[PDB]
Amino acid sequence: EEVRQFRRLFAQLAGDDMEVSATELMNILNKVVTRHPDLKTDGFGIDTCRSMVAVMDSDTTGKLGFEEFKYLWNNIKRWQAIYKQFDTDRSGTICSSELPGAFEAAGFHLNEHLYNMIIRRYSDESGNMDFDNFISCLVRLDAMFRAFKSLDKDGTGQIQVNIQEWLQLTMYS
Amino acid sequence: EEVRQFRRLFAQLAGDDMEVSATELMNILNKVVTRHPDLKTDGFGIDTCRSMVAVMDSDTTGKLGFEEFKYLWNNIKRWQAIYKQFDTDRSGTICSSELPGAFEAAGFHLNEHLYNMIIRRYSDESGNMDFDNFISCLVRLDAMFRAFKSLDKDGTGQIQVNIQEWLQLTMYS
Ligand SMILES: [Ca+2]
Ligand SMILES: [Ca+2]
Ligand SMILES: [Ca+2]
Ligand SMILES: [Ca+2]
Ligand SMILES: [Ca+2]
Ligand SMILES: [Ca+2]
Ligand SMILES: [Ca+2]
Ligand SMILES: [Ca+2]
C-alpha cells in the first residue's frame, strides 16, 4: 500500500517528463510546510531547491528520477520528524543548543567546531535555524558524507580528491 | 579619490559592526541591479547571499570585513563588465553559446562535462543564465579553485583530506 501510494505521489509530482524538477520540488515542499504551522520558515526558495536537486542528481539528467527522489523524500520525512522532536521549546526553529541533539538523532555526530561552522553558515543572527535551512543543510551534509565514503575505498579516513572530481562535487551542488 | 569613495561606501554599508552581513550584501546588490536595466534578474535572494558571504568569509567572523568585501566587490565589478561584453545579442542574459567566452575571459577553463553541470545548475530551460545566477556561479567557482590551489601548492592536481577537513571545505549552500 505504501509502495503504491508513493508511486502515485511521484507520478503526479513528476508529470509529463517523469522527473522532478527544482520547481516541482519547491512547490511540493512549500505545500508540506503550509500544513504544519509548527514548522517556521520563510519558504523553500528556488535557489535552495536547485541546489538540492543538483546534489541528489547522481546521473546528471538535471532532474530527479524515481530512485533519486525516493531517497531524498524519505530523508526529508525522517528529518522533519526529528526537527519537531528536537524543537523542545516550540519556537518552530532549531537553536544552537537544540542542533546537536537533532543532528545526532539523524546519525551525524559532529564536533563543536563543525556545529559552530554549521550555525554560522545556516542559522540566523540569533543562532536559530528555520525549517528550509535545516532541510537544505541536512541534504547537503548527507551527500557530503556519502561522497566521502565513496572515495574512501580503503577505509583509512583519508580521501584523495582530484581537481575534476572537486569541481564536479562542489559546483554541481 | 576612488579609494576614499570606496571606503565611504563600505563604511555606510557595513554599519555598526563594521562588517557586511548577507542581508546588507543582498540590499546593495539589489541596488546595483536597479541601476542597470540591461542586466536581467529575478533579484539577489537571501540564500544566495548567505552562500556568497560564507565562501568569502576567510576569517570566520560570519560577515565580510573591509578586505573580504573589497575582494568580492571588485570581482563582481569585473564579472559584470564581462557579462555585458559577452551578451552579444543584448538579451540581458548569457546563453550556453556565450558562456564559454565569458568564463574564459574571467580565466576559467572547464571541460564540456563541467559546463553541462553548470548550465543545469544555473541556467533556465532554454540555456539562458541571468545576472544573479551568473555572479553566484562565478563567486563559487573562483572560491573553489582558490580553496583547492591553496591545498595543492605542488600542482599535483590532487588534495588529501579527512572528514572534518572535507566538511569544512564543502558545507557551503
Ligand atoms: Ca517534471
Ligand atoms: Ca537524475
Ligand atoms: Ca526551538
Ligand atoms: Ca529559511
Ligand atoms: Ca553590518
Ligand atoms: Ca569575515
Ligand atoms: Ca545573451
Ligand atoms: Ca536568478
UniProtKB/Swiss-Prot annotation, chains A, B:
It is found in: Cytoplasm; Cell membrane. It comes from the Eukaryota. Ca(2+) 1 binds at residues 14, 17, 19, 24. Ca(2+) 2 binds at residues 57, 59, 61, 63, 68. Keywords: Acetylation, Calcium, Cell membrane, Cytoplasm, Membrane, Metal-binding, Phosphoprotein, Repeat. Ca(2+) 3 binds at residues 87, 89, 91, 93, 98. One of its GO terms (cellular component) is plasma membrane. Residues 1-30, 44-77, 74-109, 110-138, 139-173 form the EF-hand domain. GO terms for molecular function: calcium ion binding; calcium-dependent cysteine-type endopeptidase activity. It is linked to Pulmonary hypertension, primary, 6: A form of primary pulmonary hypertension, a disease defined by plexiform lesions of proliferating endothelial cells in pulmonary arterioles. The lesions lead to elevated pulmonary arterial pression, right ventricular failure, and death. Primary pulmonary hypertension exhibits incomplete penetrance, sex bias and variable age of onset, both within and between families. PPH6 is an autosomal recessive form. Regulatory subunit of the calcium-regulated non-lysosomal thiol-protease which catalyzes limited proteolysis of substrates involved in cytoskeletal remodeling and signal transduction. Essential for embryonic development. The contact of the 5th EF-hand domain from each monomer allows the formation of the homodimer and also appears to mediate the contact between the large catalytic subunit and small regulatory subunit for the formation of the heterodimer. Homodimer or heterodimer of a large (catalytic) and a small (regulatory) subunit. In presence of calcium, the heterodimer dissociates. This is Calpain small subunit 1. It comes from Homo sapiens. The lineage of its organism: Eukaryota, Metazoa, Chordata, Craniata, Vertebrata.
